[PDB]
Design a protein around this ligand. Structure first.
Ligand code: FES
Ligand SMILES: [K+]
Ligand SMILES: [Mg+2]
Ligand SMILES: [Mg+2]
Ligand SMILES: [Mg+2]
Ligand SMILES: [Mg+2]
Ligand SMILES: [Mg+2]
Ligand SMILES: [Mg+2]
Ligand SMILES: [Mg+2]
Ligand SMILES: [Mg+2]
Ligand SMILES: [Mg+2]
Lengths: 49, 97, 100, 86, 135, 137
RNA sequence: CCCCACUAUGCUUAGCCCUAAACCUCAACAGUUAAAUCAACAAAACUGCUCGCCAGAACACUACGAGCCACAGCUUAAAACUCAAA
């Protein structure tokens, strides 16, 4: 089971800035999608599921 | 010390307190026209202050004036005198259809 | 000759305005959600005004608008509460757009 | 008894619409408290019971008016989510 | 070994004491910084209490002498049809322009209030300012 | 002119007429809507009796004397005897909150009478006789 | 219990009787909002001062005595036996 390798180095510092959320991968994705919605504003079905 | 520090005083922007429509006016039991503006047209019932908008003091003066005027022979009890149906409507009550 | 805080506060436009009720101010739309315009006017909190029916498309992010202020912060204390409930927004009426 | 008749509690009929005239009269008597006053007067309410009900009613109105005020105040923020995704 | 009694003293006092008692083998990384540059108030839990009787908060309302002139100006002439621009830190409203002229004329020795207010309006009208009396 | 729900005041000069008769001259239908019965008397403006009908006089008895259909039947009966005497328009004065309060008025209309106004005269004492004690049911 | 009739009584007057879940179930006065806020619930927690009152349950709004326009009454108010709870 691909449990991610230890999420911190020898010094104990987590690698990801959202580590302490406990859901860094999910919230890193929400952060990236929320950021894209912002940039668009500044600039401005059957086939798949 | 410092000139720009705040100074103690009373609120200069304070607004005056609200006043009822009858604040500062004498309520006489003989002035049936005024008293009639605070009774029901169909039943003669005295309106509460939530309908008349009067303050506690004037609500009492009007009530006492109506009761005096009614039993002394100046004002009807069971209905508003029809002569006063076209006076200014100062009461927050809607009746008809 | 360093300006003190008491001096900044005395001569600030927000201090000079006095009470905010029925005061005309210039706001700036900084965020838009559908037909809800989020407008900053220099206070602690923004106000939220619905897009006007006429010339709705003229109101965009960055558009400067004219407002009539009612409250800088909408707060009320309800029965049985030790503090005040705040919605964290100002109350204002959107009049139109500011143009030169 | 001693008053003039056909003034108190009198509604005129319009275009033969007696149903609307009766509803208007019933609405007048209700708002003035007569309908509920006639009903409470069919049997004697004991003074201790009247004070209890008059105090309960007074407090339910204050509580309902205060709960409406709270809901109106906290419904200003019912708008769509401005920061969706965060 | 430690203490999670957050309402007993402060993190500094609890940490200092357990280090003395030998319970903590090493000091935490922040302890030496707190000691060198401590806060103005030691962070000790307190329970906020409600005031009763004749107890009142010490906060005072902020008022200025010119506020009296502003209250009268708004009553007499209302809020200016010109719109406040609170983003400009040097914005001057018609009321502030009125207050500054009112202050100048007072320093010229005039002391009457009703007379010092009428002369100020005339000066601004001479300068081209629009003063529409509300009533 | 706009319609007024307020009745014309006697002594004033109104333009309203019903078969050439003024409001003060229209006969009156007195409806007593009790809890167990309904009584209807039609009288002239001079207080001359013209017709009387009640649920009891229409053959209803006991618990049947107090229903809507019983009052409606009494209204039709009073309307018939009143129409024979020359009555078309009536002023309705109803006292009481019984079941035949509104139904008695319908029967008067189905019987050929036109109601021009409705007046409530339900007795309300302003302080009066002490009512009987609550029923223990 | 429901319906009808009707009385003492509710009213007035002149005397009595002196009771209530007569209860905000909060003694009077003065003071405080800082300490620990505080068994619980009620009704935020206390200080000074004074009077009244209380000391397991039940016996007991009882017995006796005493006083009272009260006479099947009121006020004051025990003990014995009994229990390990109340
Ligand atoms: S508000 Fe002043 S008498 Fe009513
Ligand atoms: K009680
Ligand atoms: Mg008797
Ligand atoms: Mg009496
Ligand atoms: Mg009592
Ligand atoms: Mg005492
Ligand atoms: Mg507690
Ligand atoms: Mg004992
Ligand atoms: Mg007893
Ligand atoms: Mg005894
Ligand atoms: Mg004895």
């Amino acid at each position: 089971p691909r449990q991610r390798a230890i999420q911190w180095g020898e010094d104990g510092r987590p690698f990801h800035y959202l580590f302490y959320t406990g859901k860094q991968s999910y919230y890193s994705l929400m952060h990236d999608v929320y950021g894209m919605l912002l940039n668009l504003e500044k600039h401005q079905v059957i086939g798949s599921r | 010390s410092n000139e720009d520090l705040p100074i103690s005083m009373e609120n200069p922007y304070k607004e005056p307190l609200k006043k009822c429509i009858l604040c500062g006016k004498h309520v006489d039991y003989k002035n049936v026209q005024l008293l009639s503006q605070f009774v029901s047209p169909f039943t003669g019932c005295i309106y509460g202050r939530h309908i008349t908008g009067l303050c506690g003091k004037k609500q009492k003066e009007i009530t006492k004036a109506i009761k005096r005027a009614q039993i002394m022979g100046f004002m009807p009890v069971t209905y508003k005198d029809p002569a006063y149906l076209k006076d200014p409507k100062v009461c927050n009550i809607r009746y008809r259809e | 000759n360093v300006e003190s805080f008491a001096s900044m506060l005395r001569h600030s436009p927000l201090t000079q305005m006095g009470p905010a009720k029925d005061k005309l101010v210039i706001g700036r739309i900084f965020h838009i959600v559908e037909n809800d315009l989020y407008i900053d006017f220099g206070g602690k909190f923004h106000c939220v005004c619905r897009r006007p029916e006429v010339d709705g498309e003229k109101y965009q992010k960055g558009t400067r608008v004219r407002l009539r202020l009612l409250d800088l912060e909408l707060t009320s204390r309800f029965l049985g509460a030790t503090t005040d409930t705040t919605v964290l927004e100002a109350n204002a009426v959107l009049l139109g757009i500011q143009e030169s | 008894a001693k008053h003039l008749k056909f003034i108190a509690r009198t509604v005129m009929v319009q275009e033969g619409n007696v149903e609307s005239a009766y509803r208007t009269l019933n609405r007048i008597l209700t708002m003035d408290g007569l309908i509920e006053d006639i009903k409470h007067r069919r049997y004697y309410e004991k003074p201790c019971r009247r004070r209890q009900r008059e105090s309960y009613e007074r407090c339910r109105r204050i509580y309902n008016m205060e709960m409406a005020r709270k809901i109106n105040f906290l419904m200003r923020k019912n708008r769509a989510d401005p920061w969706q995704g965060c | 070994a430690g203490s999670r009694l957050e309402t007993v003293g402060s993190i500094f006092s609890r940490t200092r004491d357990l280090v003395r008692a030998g319970v903590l083998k090493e000091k935490p990384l922040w302890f030496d910084v707190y000691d060198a540059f401590p806060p103005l108030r030691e962070p000790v839990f307190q329970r906020p209490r409600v005031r009763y009787g004749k107890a009142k908060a010490p906060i005072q309302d902020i008022w200025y002498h010119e506020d009296r002139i502003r209250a009268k100006f708004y009553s007499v002439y209302g809020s200016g049809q010109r719109a406040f621009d609170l983003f400009n830190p040097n914005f001057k409203s018609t009321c502030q322009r009125f207050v500054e002229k009112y202050t100048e004329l007072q320093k010229l020795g005039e002391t009457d209030e009703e007379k010092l207010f009428v002369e100020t309006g005339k000066a601004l009208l001479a300068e081209g300012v629009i003063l529409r009396r509300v009533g | 002119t706009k319609f007024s729900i307020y009745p014309p005041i006697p002594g004033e000069e109104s333009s309203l007429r019903w078969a050439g008769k003024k409001f003060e001259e229209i006969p009156i239908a007195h409806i007593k809507a009790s809890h167990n019965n309904t009584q209807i008397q039609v009288v002239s403006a001079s207080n001359e009796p013209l017709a009387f009908a009640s649920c009891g006089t229409e053959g209803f008895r006991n618990a049947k004397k107090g229903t809507g259909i019983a009052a409606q039947t009494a209204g039709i009966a009073a309307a018939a005897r009143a129409k024979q005497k020359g009555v078309i328009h009536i002023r309705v004065v109803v006292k009481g909150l019984g079941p035949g309060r509104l139904s008695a008025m319908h029967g008067l209309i189905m019987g050929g009478l036109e109601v021009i106004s409705i007046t409530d005269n339900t007795p309300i004492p302003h302080x009066g006789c002490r009512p009987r004690k609550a029923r223990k049911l």
